[PDB]
Write a protein that binds this ligand. Sequence first.
Ligand code: UDP
Ligand code: UDP
Ligand code: XDX
Ligand code: XDX
Ligand code: MN
Ligand code: MN
Lengths: 278, 278
Amino acid sequence: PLDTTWHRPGWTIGELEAAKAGRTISVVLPALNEEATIESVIDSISPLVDGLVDELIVLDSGSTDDTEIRAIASGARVVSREQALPEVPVRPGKGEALWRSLAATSGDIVVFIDSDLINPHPLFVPWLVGPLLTGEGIQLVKSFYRGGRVTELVARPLLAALRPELGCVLQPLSGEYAASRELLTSLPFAPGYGVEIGLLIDTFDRLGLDAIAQVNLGVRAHRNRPLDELGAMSRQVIATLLSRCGIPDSGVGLTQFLYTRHTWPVSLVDRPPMKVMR
Amino acid sequence: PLDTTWHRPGWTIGELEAAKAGRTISVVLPALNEEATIESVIDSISPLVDGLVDELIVLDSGSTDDTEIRAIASGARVVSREQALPEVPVRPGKGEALWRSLAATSGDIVVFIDSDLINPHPLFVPWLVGPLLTGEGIQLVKSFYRGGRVTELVARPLLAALRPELGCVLQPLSGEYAASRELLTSLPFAPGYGVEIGLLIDTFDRLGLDAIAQVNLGVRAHRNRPLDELGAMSRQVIATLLSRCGIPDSGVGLTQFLYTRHTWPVSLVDRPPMKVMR
Ligand SMILES: O=c1ccn([C@@H]2O[C@H](COP(=O)(O)OP(=O)(O)O)[C@@H](O)[C@H]2O)c(=O)[nH]1
Ligand SMILES: O=c1ccn([C@@H]2O[C@H](COP(=O)(O)OP(=O)(O)O)[C@@H](O)[C@H]2O)c(=O)[nH]1
Ligand SMILES: O=C(O)[C@@H](COP(=O)(O)O)O[C@H]1O[C@H](CO)[C@@H](O)[C@H](O)[C@H]1O
Ligand SMILES: O=C(O)[C@@H](COP(=O)(O)O)O[C@H]1O[C@H](CO)[C@@H](O)[C@H](O)[C@H]1O
Ligand SMILES: [Mn+2]
Ligand SMILES: [Mn+2]
């Protein structure tokens, strides 16, 4: 029921660049403390600039390490959250950075690539924009690949429970996807780690499956985090997913006993469609 | 807000056995293919028989390996699901076995110990019945200890979302707990791996927190399973948890792409309170 390129796409960079037909392509890498990996990621994409890709920015989500200077040294334009929308104070979390990035870019197509990937293939951006440029009716392109414990224990079982029409999607929370600016500026942006599951469910409720494609990116690798930082990610994924399914969420943060106690933040506050800022 | 023995309880086996006061104690080990571990588990408890513990059974949930003969060789009474309730056909899953075991035992207090524990401490049963025998108003005693990825990514975040009053419980899905027969035969029994989260939420909705205690069992170890068998456990945990929170569950099983497709069963069918079979 869901368009799925299962094996390596066949289009070439010149074919895809032809099919642009006046549309522009923006690439955004959100970065919070990724000095180790940001340079390899930028370098996998920058060859495409002025060709297929018209714009590449690194949205610096508050990095205190060498992310900014290493990204500058790789030729990337670096935008802080403040610089993307200065009149609006900054909130924490990933969803904030991706929402803000819509103001700092202008491509008709926006591509999101996580800045914590290790040895990312240089055909990621070409593989993601493929269905947008060639397919008709595609507005969102998620990716799948190949670890994935929030996805496989939280997101996918919960979608099976509440939005079973999205059971065919293989990586709902994937950080690598592309979508049209029209779609992105229409949708609200969940906070924190809810942003991906939120844009998936919202796109489906607004356009159905036939506007959603997914593409195989081979196999991936990234930081594999501690189980506790996943508890908080899981919580925010649940919070967002319940909201889009009309289920009230208590707003209570996950408390963990390490034994010593600590409560993690969870946000129920979405950012509005970027359209309202026109 | 929740009674919690944080460190090793102080009662001794003779003190606890005095506080029995005419009540009997039944111990149940549900077993599906546990030949490797069933003997060590039985042996940690059998010294207590005819003393604190009045009855120990192994409810054989369909084992095709040497679980039954090794359990017999360790002096345990072995009951099959058929033998516990012959007039009712057998359904799969853990919840079925624990429900059936209420018919095959008769203690005023029932203690459940997973038969897949490695080197279980012989004070587990004494530590679990402690609050039931000495405390007043305690009807359910959960355990905590010390891995725990369904618990920490699914159960606890979801309880925070939907039943935040149970955020203090440290291991909602723990297989080691004790409860009164009156409570257990009043409650329905979720199917499969939903049985623990179901008995927790149901007990709370019926008696509040002050009927629930939890006790430290130190540190544990068991099989650490594949991520896919956890996906299905997670699904059934979600299914049961949504039901007790009045949220409709689609009944759609989790589909996984290993890429090759496969859908796992999920059950929405609880067993009724064992009382209805009187
Ligand atoms: O407030 C935030 C949180 C995350 N990220 C980015 O989102 C991606 C996914 O974050 P995750 O925490 O899963 O990875 P890690 O922290 O291990 O690098 C990474 O590129 C982060 O730099 C971000 O820009 N802002
Ligand atoms: O249909 C079932 C499923 C599980 N169990 C028991 O429930 C406990 C927890 O099961 P789990 O699958 O988590 O452990 P494992 O299969 O790795 O031994 C174990 O003692 C199993 O023998 C059972 O008796 N019947
Ligand atoms: O699912 C998860 O728990 C992690 C993968 O990290 P693990 O190695 O599973 O701890 O990644 C999630 O978030 C990533 C960033 O947003 C996405 O790229 C993954 O699709 C998603 O699974
Ligand atoms: O939470 C889980 O995923 C597992 C622990 O296994 P893992 O090593 O975390 O894969 O155990 C759950 O189920 C057990 C049996 O019912 C319980 O004893 C645990 O409390 C529960 O966490
Ligand atoms: Mn990552
Ligand atoms: Mn176990």
